[PDB]
Amino acid sequence: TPQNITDLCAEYHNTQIYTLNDKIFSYTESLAGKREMAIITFKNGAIFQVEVPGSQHIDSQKKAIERMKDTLRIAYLTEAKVEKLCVWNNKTPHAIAAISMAN
Amino acid sequence: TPQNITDLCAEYHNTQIYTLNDKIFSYTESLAGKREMAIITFKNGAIFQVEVPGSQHIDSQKKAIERMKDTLRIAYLTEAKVEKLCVWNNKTPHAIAAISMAN
Amino acid sequence: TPQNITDLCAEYHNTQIYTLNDKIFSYTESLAGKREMAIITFKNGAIFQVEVPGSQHIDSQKKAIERMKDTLRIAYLTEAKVEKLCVWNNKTPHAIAAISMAN
Amino acid sequence: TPQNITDLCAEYHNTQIYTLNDKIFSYTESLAGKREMAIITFKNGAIFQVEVPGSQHIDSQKKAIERMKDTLRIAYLTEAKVEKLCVWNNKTPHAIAAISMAN
Amino acid sequence: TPQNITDLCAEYHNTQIYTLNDKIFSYTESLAGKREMAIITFKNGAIFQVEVPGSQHIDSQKKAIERMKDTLRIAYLTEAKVEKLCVWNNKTPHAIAAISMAN
Ligand SMILES: CC(=O)N[C@H]1[C@H]([C@H](O)[C@H](O)CO)O[C@](C(=O)O)(n2cc(CCC(=O)NCC[C@@H]3O[C@H](CO)[C@H](O)[C@H](O)[C@H]3O)nn2)C[C@@H]1O
Ligand SMILES: CC(=O)N[C@H]1[C@H]([C@H](O)[C@H](O)CO)O[C@](C(=O)O)(n2cc(CCC(=O)NCC[C@@H]3O[C@H](CO)[C@H](O)[C@H](O)[C@H]3O)nn2)C[C@@H]1O
Ligand SMILES: CC(=O)N[C@H]1[C@H]([C@H](O)[C@H](O)CO)O[C@](C(=O)O)(n2cc(CCC(=O)NCC[C@@H]3O[C@H](CO)[C@H](O)[C@H](O)[C@H]3O)nn2)C[C@@H]1O
Ligand SMILES: CC(=O)N[C@H]1[C@H]([C@H](O)[C@H](O)CO)O[C@](C(=O)O)(n2cc(CCC(=O)NCC[C@@H]3O[C@H](CO)[C@H](O)[C@H](O)[C@H]3O)nn2)C[C@@H]1O
Ligand SMILES: CC(=O)N[C@H]1[C@H]([C@H](O)[C@H](O)CO)O[C@](C(=O)O)(n2cc(CCC(=O)NCC[C@@H]3O[C@H](CO)[C@H](O)[C@H](O)[C@H]3O)nn2)C[C@@H]1O
């Protein structure tokens, strides 16, 4: 089991770490069908999604996907600093796999 | 995949964007049978609903409908500025499809 | 579909609007069997319940009853002003159907 | 149906009301198997549990047990004054049946 | 049934108590498949995980694991002082079994 987000991110293909060290600039969420997703942006312009659940996801991920959207909403509303994101870079917007908050 | 609320909204028939840039003026929710819904208003007089779940919705939307009502309640209570709403205009009140929030 | 709590309230028998324009004075909830309920009061003496889920409720109400208890708890803790309650007046305490909040 | 916690509490065998009129001093929760429970204390040394779900509990209590732990956690974190607890006194620590919050 | 975290912790093999008396320094969560987990750190560098649900868990733990991640996220965001953790020390990072919070 990994020790931190960077090492966790390295356990997967098609990923990279971004170091934001910043609060979320905007939070978007949709209930429209086939676009049940969240999008966040940061002041540096970067855009990220929580993907719509799909055939690529295994069942254990479904609750985690819901949790992540909960996290991002409350992080946005609390202006919590996001340290790093681990994202899949084979999707546009890049798709969030993990988040770290600190400081 | 769309990268913002405007482009997401334009992927559907009978939708449009409203630009509020304001906090929610009032939040209403009901548990009454056949009216399990939320209504929000803004100071400019705009009125929007989160629709009662029905057969027009696909199954993936159900969780997202519940999440949206969670989002609107907390946005109301935290006085978060709503940037945009994507709504369906073939319902009265217009029905919320997506929300964006920014400073 | 109604556009406000008063109009929604009028779509049911044995209801009435109470206008509070006040924060909740006390919040009570129970896990005891057959009394899985919430009770709120206001400083004017008014007492209201969220009913125990029962035979009178249709399936779609179950989630909304849980949400209403969530809403009342957080309204209480944040001292949010309650504008109106739509209540059924054929129960004692009167039973909450809907809530509106505004500053 | 009862209109307050004292009257509700009195509808059960082996219960009693504790009047605290104080915030929660500590909140403990466990995910350890067979100890999936919460324990709260007050500065006067009083200790109470939310019981591990068991065959004592009827089906309708299961959701309310989980809500109660949610309520205690957020009460703790908001420093909300707990007015009274209804507890079962045939368990050690005494087991929470209901809570009221008021100033 | 135990009356505090220390006593609860001692009801299990492969456990120990850490005394932090500090807020969480960082919160990390992941939705990546097979790594649906959370990791927290404290300012002294100590790292702890909420484990991915696995064969070792009994069914009653599944809700509690989800609750714990909820608790850690809100504790982090509120800067709530963690008193103690009970952890399994046969995993790395050490795996949280229970948490106590006190000011
Ligand atoms: C910690 C761990 O188990 N890591 C392993 C992961 C993992 O098992 C799967 O991602 C879980 O579904 O599977 C890895 C991985 O890198 O994703 N894997 C999986 C595969 C074949 C199938 C595959 O790529 N599945 C993941 C698809 C990705 O899903 C992601 C969501 O979870 C994203 O949507 C991403 O854009 C998509 O490409 N080849 N390698 C190998 C890696 O060692
Ligand atoms: C991104 C994407 O998939 N967009 C497509 C959507 C989408 O597949 C469905 O809305 C999902 O159920 O379906 C579109 C759409 O515009 O809604 N669509 C669907 C249909 C036939 C069935 C249909 O109209 N379904 C939507 C009904 C609408 O549901 C909405 C709630 O989700 C609202 O209640 C709205 O008032 C109602 O008219 N014709 N066009 C075509 C669009 O390209
Ligand atoms: C918008 C809408 O659909 N409104 C209709 C409602 C509604 O369909 C039901 O209340 C939903 O279960 O059903 C109405 C009503 O006023 O409740 N209705 C229902 C009936 C027969 C069955 C009936 O009385 N159901 C409601 C029972 C009430 O349930 C309530 C909880 O939802 C309360 O517990 C209340 O104390 C109880 O009397 N006769 N009229 C007629 C109303 O036009
Ligand atoms: C409002 C109401 O319905 N009150 C009634 C309750 C109630 O139906 C049950 O407690 C719900 O499970 O059942 C009462 C009660 O006092 O608990 N009851 C139940 C019984 C036989 C079964 C029984 O004792 N159930 C309660 C066991 C208690 O469960 C509790 C959790 O719910 C606690 O764990 C407690 O420590 C334990 O003794 N005898 N009396 C009679 C009481 O009139
Ligand atoms: C209060 C109580 O019932 N405590 C008992 C626990 C308990 O029943 C189980 O841990 C619940 O699954 O089972 C104890 C224990 O110490 O965990 N137990 C269990 C066993 C054999 C199987 C076993 O070790 N299960 C626990 C595995 C542990 O799961 C943990 C998560 O729950 C961690 O992942 C840990 O890293 C792992 O070793 N031997 N002793 C004996 C202890 O008296």
Residue numbers in the entry:
A (entry chain C), B (entry chain B), C (entry chain A), D (entry chain E), E (entry chain D): 1 to 103
Give verbatim excerpts from the published study on this entry.
CT and LT, with their five equivalent binding subunits, are known to be multivalent proteins. Binding has been described as a “two-fingered grip”, provided by the two terminal residues, galactose (Gal) and sialic acid (NeuAc). The specificity of this interaction is mainly determined by the terminal galactose residue, which is buried in a deep pocket at the rugged underside of the toxin (distant from the A-subunit). As expected, all three inhibitors bind in the primary binding site, acting as decoys for the toxins’ main receptor, the GM1 ganglioside.
Compounds 2 and 3 are bidentate ligands that combine the two terminal residues of the GM1 oligosaccharide, i.e. galactose and sialic acid. The cholera toxins come in two varieties: classical (c) and El Tor (ET). The two biotypes differ at two amino acid residues in the B-subunit, 18 and 47 (His18 and Thr47 in cCTB, and Tyr18 and Ile47 in ET CTB). The crystal structures were solved to 1.1 Å resolution and contain one B-pentamer in the asymmetric unit. Both CT variants have well-defined electron density for inhibitor 2 in all binding sites. As in the other structures, the galactose moiety of 2 is buried in the GM1 binding site, H-bonding with Glu51, Gln61, Asn90 and Lys91. The sialic acid residue has direct interactions with the backbones of Glu11 and His13. The differences to GM1-os binding can be seen in the linker region of 2, where the hydrogen bond of the core Gal to the side chain of His13 is no longer achievable. Instead, closer to the terminal Gal, the carbonyl group of the linker engages in a water-mediated interaction to Asn14.
